[PDB]
Amino acid sequence: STLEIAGLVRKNLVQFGVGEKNGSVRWVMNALGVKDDWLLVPSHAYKFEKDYEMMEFYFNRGGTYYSISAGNVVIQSLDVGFQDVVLMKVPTIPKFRDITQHFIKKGDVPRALNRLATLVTTVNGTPMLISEGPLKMEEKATYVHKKNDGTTVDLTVDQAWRGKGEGLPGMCGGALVSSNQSIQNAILGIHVAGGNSILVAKLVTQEMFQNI
Numbered sequence: 615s616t617l618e619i620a621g622l623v624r625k626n627l628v629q630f631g632v633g634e635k636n637g638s639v640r641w642v643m644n645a646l647g648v649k650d651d652w653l654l655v656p657s658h659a660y661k662f663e664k665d666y667e668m669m670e671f672y673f674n675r676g677g678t679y680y681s682i683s684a685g686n687v688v689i690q691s692l693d694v695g696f697q698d699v700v701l702m703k704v705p706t707i708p709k710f711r712d713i714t715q716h717f718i719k720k721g722d723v724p725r726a727l728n729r730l731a732t733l734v735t736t737v738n739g740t741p742m743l744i745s746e747g748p749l750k751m752e753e754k755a756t757y758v759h760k761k762n763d764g765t766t767v768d769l770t771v772d773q774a775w776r777g778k779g780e781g782l783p784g785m786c787g788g789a790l791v792s793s794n795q796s797i798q799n800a801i802l803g804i805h806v807a808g809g810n811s812i813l814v815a816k817l818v819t820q821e822m823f824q825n826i
């Protein structure tokens with residue numbers, strides 16, 4: 615069911631934060647553990663600020679905090695080009711339950727179109743289920759990211775789900791789950807943007823985990 619998939623997502627969601635060494639942590643959004651010490655996270659969380667590699671990354675797992683130098687996480691792309699969401703290996707994180715087989719197969723993508731979905735996310739660790747209207751797929755989606763200094767950047771990714779719904783700051787990095795039971799309520803991707811009552815999630819397929 616949606617609710618049981620949601621519980622699996624919930625247990626693998628951690629809070630992602632960034633800080634200078636010996637400085638205060640800014641909690642930014644969610645990241646999703648997928649297998650072993652690999653997580654999915656929107657790279658817009660960190661990559662557009664100066665000297666990101668000199669920062670400490672923090673992973674809050676239910677009130678137990680794991681940190682690592684940003685230069686010591688291993689980042690792997692999902693596909694060629696900018697996809698925002700990346701795979702990130704964090705050697706200091708406890709192993710995750712493997713949820714890769716719960717993600718939609720590329721061939722089954724059409725089965726989630728025109729159907730409801732649920733964004734399974736948190737705001738700063740507080741779990742939320744957010745209803746999304748019948749889904750469409752955008753071959754290219756563009757959204758605006760606001761940096762810490764107020765300046766903005768336009769981001770464009772390939773293959774992003776679009777659904778009517780109401781998101782809040784901090785919900786990025788949560789997982790979109792299909793209402794379609796016939797594909798076992800597959801996880802469809804990762805929330806990257808919300809606005810004008812539109813929620814946007816980068817498609818992530820089972821096949822993309824082959825990138826290791």
Ligand SMILES: *C[C@H](NC(=O)OCc1ccccc1)C(=O)O
Pocket residue numbers: 622711712713715716
């Ligand atoms: C949610 C996970 N399920 C899973 O990996 O399913 C793979 C499967 C299940 C049944 C038949 C064939 C393959 C889990 O944690 O087990």
